[model samples]
Target: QAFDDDTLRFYRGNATAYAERQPRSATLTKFLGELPAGAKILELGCGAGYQAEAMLAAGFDVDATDGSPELAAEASRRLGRPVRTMLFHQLDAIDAYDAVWAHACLLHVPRDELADVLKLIWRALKPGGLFYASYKSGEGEGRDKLARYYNYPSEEWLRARYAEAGTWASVAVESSEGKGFDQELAQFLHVSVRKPEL
Candidate 1:
């Protein structure tokens, strides 16, 4: 199924409760710890603003955007601040962020379009800026129970994709079981790449 405002509404309704149900706050804190203080951060697909809230609490400047207006509304409400709401095409600002946080969001992009989206993300970050992105690690790409599309990439595949985009710096992968899910979920390929300082 194609992504639209309805999917956004569904995710917005579920995200806040999902955050509360899991210990994601600590995970977010740990992830944020890697960045320097007071960094300018942009979050893609920031549903419910949980990670955005943590970044704000950590003293990082944050601007969040999501394709779903409903999700953006919930995020703005939770954040008590304005957030950009539009399709991915609306993200036109460039080279303005120190870091980009894409938590389980870019996976929704169909494989054919992911490279172009990554290029957009790369252009949005300053030179030497870092990016943190995650994907559900598996064999291939397909949809899940929520009718949302997913493109699961193995470590080798992810590395190659980043390299092909000419945005590769460093990448690592690990597997872990997630709470509230019984499957042996491979939460691998939490990547940290930097734009060349040139």
Candidate 2:
């Protein structure tokens, strides 16, 4: 689903502030800090490129993309360079990356479309590459008032889904609290998983 102009504007205005105010969770920091320098990183749904900027600061070769053109333009301007452009429903990458970070982006995907998208992500990674993904955490899925999609999968469900999509290793899941839109909310199912070394 496409983000409307209003929603896009909201994101454009708030992206930087959100980035600045967001507390770096231990899970997020440990995962990002451990990445080897010079690793090729692809950040999906990278709004405003804050996370991309963080990775870049950590010495990663980061290429970031977002679904909204407005957001992408803002991020490019903020980052002082072009990365890439993508639509939420049309996420695909041919370049192999050492790591892929989806963060809060994948939650917008329709539940039925998640498996295919995840398989696409797996294909985008090299064998033995790592992936970090997160979801809102709950049973079932739906959409928010702005018509943006939202899905909250249980840990078991996420593990099964990832395994079914050809990802090896049981996903490691954790929970944390963070600001969302306008309020603080509990975040669940922060995960790290790896592609098999076959």
Candidate 3:
């Protein structure tokens, strides 16, 4: 049970390298770029801390956070700033940020709890503010060989969940291929949505 409870290995294995060499995400840049200058951005499940670094360099106010203390420390170390140690469900700020980002993070959420998480994300954003997230595009949830639980959702599923059911606007759901941590090839479902302004 000790080993099963050990969560560090899931990210601590090569996180330092990832934080050092991680490429700034193109989609993350594109979404945040559309916002006004100095727009505030919240990065959940910040892995390598590169996204927060890149956004900070790009002139956006960034609140970078991760569930792993080790990983969060790496972010803080690289950024020369505090990287909040918080979980997705701990996101309780109200209308606080212009945008919330969750690239490679929410895929770990249980399928049954996904909608509640989205509601939380919706509340976390300012009205009409932007939200972006990524997940492995597939069906079901399970652990990978590297011992991480990934919740894969199909494109259609994401669309209806955020757009139709949640009533979020400008919802764009698409797929892209990439390789990252765990060093495996993956097809990721990228989602962009906006909370209503009124």
TM-score of each: 0.84, 0.84, 0.89
> Can you write out model 1's per-residue Cα lDDT over 1-198, one digit (the tens) per residue?
234444455565665554343225544665677778999998888866778887898899998887766668777887899877755435566889988888777766667666667777788888878887877777898666665566777778877777776665655554444532223344645777888775
Q: For candidate 2, what is the lDDT?
A: 0.72
Q: Give the top-scoring candidate (lDDT).
A: 3
Worst 10 residues of 2 by lDDT: 1-10
Q: Write the per-residue lDDT of candidate 2 for residues 1-198, one digit (tens) a residue.
A: 333344455565665564455435466577777577789988888876767777777788888888766668767887887957775546566538888888787876666777777888888887778888878877887556544456778788887778777756546777776656646475656878887775
Which segments of model 3 are wrong by more than 4 Å? 1-9, 12-14, 17-21, 163-165
Give candidate 1 misplaced runs (Cα > 4 Å).
Answer: 1-23, 179-186
Candidate 1 yields a Cα-based lDDT of 0.71
- Report clashes for each candidate as comma-separated counts: 0, 0, 1
Candidate 1: Cα lDDT at 172: 51
Which digits, one per residue and each the tens of the lDDT, describe model 3 over residues 66-185?
Answer: 877778989898899999888777777889999988988788777666777788788888988989898887777678877777767888877766753366868877778887567788
